[PDB]
Amino acid sequence: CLSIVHSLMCHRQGGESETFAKRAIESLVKKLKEKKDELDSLITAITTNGAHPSKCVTIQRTLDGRLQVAGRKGFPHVIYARLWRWPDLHKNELKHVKYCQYAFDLKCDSVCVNPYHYERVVS
Amino acid sequence: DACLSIVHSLMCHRQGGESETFAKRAIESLVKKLKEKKDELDSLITAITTNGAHPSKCVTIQRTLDGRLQVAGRKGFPHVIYARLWRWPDLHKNELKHVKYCQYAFDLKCDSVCVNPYHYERVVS
DNA sequence: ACGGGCCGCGGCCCGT
DNA sequence: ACGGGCCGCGGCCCGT
Ligand SMILES: [Cl-]
Ligand SMILES: [Cl-]
Ligand SMILES: [Zn+2]
Ligand SMILES: [Zn+2]
């Protein structure tokens, strides 16, 4: 589990602190512990820079839709996209790919946080 | 809404066991849980206000995984917190024995815990 | 195996 | 909708 967190940490971008990244990754890995296929799809997607199409990586949607990490609240798909792909990401600059089944905009009970299931768009 | 008068009257019957702020936080927490349980809330007001003059109904809250309740950053058993508040300000661990009348006593290991202080009696054991 | 810590996050309510 | 601080249950680790 620690080797998984460490391997995902190696692919973070300089958007936030090392400590924020660690807490965000630990939180996500713990939720995917009982979902082997989703965890494997996350490791493969991050490690290979989304080289091949990956499966949805989902977490339970909160009542307000935001996730809190180290005292900061934000949309979960935005947090993980900022962390591994766009460190300067803000507002509504994300558009989900047609392949993504559990995209944040699709208003499902489960939210896809796979950063390679979203693409950056102009404001 | 209309909770403020209920919290205030229960506050009037607290004992000098803890701070005024701790007592309000504990009472507000309990009143909010009993908002949808009219009979249990009325039994709590009647029991506290009359110093347990007549037999009252069980006043229950949902049991937590660990069995303890947190109030203003401090953890403790819920039946102990409310018994210390309204009856025994100097109350310690293993000093409470539930009355035969009490259906949801902490020791009975139910999904619901009775926090009515007049449903427990102080012992030496 | 308790208690007694604090410690992060969801649910919560209140401010530009 | 935001961006906080808010408190508490659910976690965890520490001294007995
Ligand atoms: Cl989207
Ligand atoms: Cl008991
Ligand atoms: Zn997806
Ligand atoms: Zn009872």
Side-chain angles (χ1 to χ4, degrees), chain A residues 1-29 31-32 35 37-90 92-94 96-97 99-106 108-123, chain B residues 2-31 33-37 39-92 94-96 98-99 101-108 110-125:
Chain A
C1 167
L2 279 161
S3 68
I4 288 151
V5 177
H6 181 254
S7 73
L8 294 165
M9 274 292 280
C10 176
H11 297 266
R12 78 193 165 93
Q13 294 209 33
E16 284 88 27
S17 68
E18 190 166 327
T19 60
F20 180 96
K22 187 106 173 142
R23 300 297 159 98
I25 300 178
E26 281 168 351
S27 169
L28 181 54
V29 172
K31 289 168 182 177
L32 304 170
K35 316 172 79 190
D37 284 339
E38 289 188 28
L39 178 73
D40 291 357
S41 201
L42 174 72
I43 306 152
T44 311
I46 300 315
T47 307
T48 70
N49 299 129
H52 294 280
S54 52
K55 296 167 163 74
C56 284
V57 174
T58 70
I59 62 166
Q60 187 71 32
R61 190 183 289 260
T62 57
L63 290 173
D64 63 350
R66 296 173 300 168
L67 165 67
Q68 183 174 141
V69 181
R72 204 159 60 94
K73 283 181 162 180
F75 298 108
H77 66 302
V78 175
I79 291 162
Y80 297 102
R82 196 155 348 100
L83 206 125
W84 286 300
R85 292 189 83 185
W86 304 288
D88 60 331
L89 192 73
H90 39 58
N92 173 29
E93 297 199 76
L94 289 181
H96 72 269
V97 67
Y99 186 89
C100 187
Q101 298 176 9
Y102 295 93
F104 172 85
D105 279 8
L106 300 180
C108 316
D109 302 331
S110 292
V111 178
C112 180
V113 297
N114 184 337
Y116 296 99
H117 276 215
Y118 299 90
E119 291 309 332
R120 201 180 185 168
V121 286
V122 304
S123 300
Chain B
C3 287
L4 283 153
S5 69
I6 293 179
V7 171
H8 186 251
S9 57
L10 293 165
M11 273 293 278
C12 177
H13 297 267
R14 78 192 164 92
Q15 295 207 33
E18 282 88 26
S19 67
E20 188 167 330
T21 60
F22 181 94
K24 189 178 258 77
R25 294 272 284 274
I27 299 177
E28 281 178 325
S29 169
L30 181 55
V31 171
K33 289 169 183 178
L34 305 170
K35 207 260 185 181
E36 303 301 316
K37 316 172 80 190
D39 284 342
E40 288 189 27
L41 179 73
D42 290 0
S43 199
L44 175 72
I45 306 152
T46 311
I48 300 315
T49 308
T50 71
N51 299 129
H54 294 279
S56 52
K57 295 166 167 74
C58 284
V59 174
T60 70
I61 62 166
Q62 186 72 31
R63 190 182 290 259
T64 57
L65 291 171
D66 62 351
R68 39 206 173 96
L69 165 69
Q70 184 174 136
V71 180
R74 203 160 64 90
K75 283 180 166 185
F77 299 105
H79 66 302
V80 177
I81 290 163
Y82 297 102
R84 194 149 54 233
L85 230 185
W86 287 298
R87 292 189 83 184
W88 305 287
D90 60 334
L91 195 72
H92 307 286
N94 294 297
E95 285 183 356
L96 289 180
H98 71 269
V99 68
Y101 186 87
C102 187
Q103 299 178 7
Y104 295 92
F106 173 84
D107 279 9
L108 298 179
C110 315
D111 301 330
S112 293
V113 179
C114 180
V115 297
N116 185 336
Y118 295 98
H119 276 215
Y120 300 107
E121 290 303 327
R122 200 180 183 168
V123 287
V124 189
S125 301

